[PDB]
């Protein structure tokens, strides 16, 4: 009841990125214990207000996982990321979206 597991963070788009075309940005957070977690989607370092997320679930190894997602319109210069905070992290962990 003592070992904690840090979250894995994977950022991906629903559709191939086409500049100026509406898409969906996904952030899958998994492999973490305990369950309390804060997840934000960012646009140029700023928090996106309207983000949807799945209800809590866990894998057969008891690790928790969640899907966070939002509609987004990618451009050439705009940056997107997933920011996570968990008891296993001293600072928030940021994983940037990269179409390449």
């Amino acid at each position: 009841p003592k070992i904690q597991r840090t979250p894995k963070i994977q950022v991906y788009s629903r559709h191939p990125a086409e500049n100026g075309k509406s898409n969906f940005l996904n952030c899958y957070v998994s492999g973490f214990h305990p369950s309390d977690i804060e997840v934000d989607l960012l646009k140029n370092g700023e928090r996106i207000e309207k983000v949807e997320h799945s209800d809590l679930s866990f894998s057969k190894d008891w690790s928790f996982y969640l899907l966070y997602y939002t509609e987004f319109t990618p451009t050439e210069k705009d940056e997107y990321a997933c920011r996570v905070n968990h008891v296993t992290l001293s600072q928030p962990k940021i994983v940037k979206w990269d179409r390449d």
Binding site: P1, K2, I3, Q4, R5, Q10, Y12, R14, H15, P16, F24, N26, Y28, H33, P34, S35, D36, E52, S54, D55, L56, S57, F58, W62, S63, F64, L67, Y69, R99, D100
Partner: protein, 280 residues
């Protein structure tokens, strides 16, 4: 039939201190959510119009009431006995229970519990089996719980009598969504360079349902054994995403293609061709 073949409920009960605990719960067909639990009302959330399967509204309300009493009672009892079980706060308990349809038609039921993200107990043949990871605490727990006449009987009925009929009824009721066929889309990208003079090529496959899929890097009709399948990732609205990668030397990327096979494609595979010199 394609799609999910099992039903389970989960519980996550987070004990902050001796006077504050909260529970999250939900109902699933494999990894597709069909029930939610609303802690504001102590009732379920039916996520699909067919989420009650072939059960009457009366039977469903009876089951919601069993879960509401269980969720409240679980926290009450764990807080009352935490001292006797030498519990240190905070701690978190997980539970999963349900049943699955196997080849040959047998339905098998299961119940597992965890403490601190480690196995704590399981139910085998309507008996409480402590997990070795649970130590003497799990042995103490099983010996205490089996003396609850009402609980042992309610658990036996739910796992072995209620679950199998609910599963068959809901697999049938939801077959329009559970056995639907959704076509994937696929695209290529040039991934993070694994080292000097090496490239990583990425074949993306997204939006397919059901989950079984076949993706491979090819040179003509030759399957590249070096293809690395990523883990299947979810999309919102019951579809999946998968990356298939291949690490190659710079001058070896020409001639590669990615082939995708999926149940929805009616045998018409997707073939993508990698072209060099920034020609996509």
């Amino acid at each position: 039939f394609q799609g999910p073949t099992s039903f389970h409920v989960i519980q996550t009960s987070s004990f902050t201190n001796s006077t504050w605990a909260q529970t999250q719960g939900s109902g699933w067909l494999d990894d597709l959510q069909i029930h939610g639990w609303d802690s504001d009302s102590g009732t379920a959330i039916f996520l699909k119009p067919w989420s009650k399967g072939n059960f009457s509204d009366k039977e469903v309300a009876e089951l919601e009431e069993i879960f509401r009493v269980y969720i409240f009672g679980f926290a009450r009892e764990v807080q009352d006995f935490a001292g006797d079980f030498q519990m240190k706060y905070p701690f978190e308990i997980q539970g999963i229970a349900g049943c699955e349809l196997h080849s040959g038609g047998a339905i098998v039921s299961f119940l597992r519990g965890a403490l601190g993200g480690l196995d704590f107990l399981s139910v085998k043949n309507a008996s409480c089996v402590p997990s070795p990871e649970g130590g003497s605490r799990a042995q103490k727990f099983c010996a205490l719980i089996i003396q609850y006449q009402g609980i042992m009987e309610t658990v036996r009925i739910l796992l072995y009598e209620t679950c199998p009929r609910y599963l068959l009824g809901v697999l049938n009721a939801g077959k329009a969504d559970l056995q639907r066929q959704v076509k994937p889309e696929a695209w290529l990208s040039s991934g993070p360079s694994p080292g000097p003079g090496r490239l990583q090529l990425v074949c993306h496959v997204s939006g397919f349902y059901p989950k079984p899929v076949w993706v491979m890097w090819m040179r003509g009709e030759q399957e590249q054994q070096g293809t690395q399948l990523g883990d299947i990732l979810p999309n919102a609205n019951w579809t999946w995403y998968l990356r298939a990668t291949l690490d190659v030397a710079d001058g070896e990327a020409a001639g590669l293609s990615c082939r995708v096979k999926h149940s929805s494609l009616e045998g018409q595979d997707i073939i993508l061709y990698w072209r060099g010199s920034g020609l996509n």
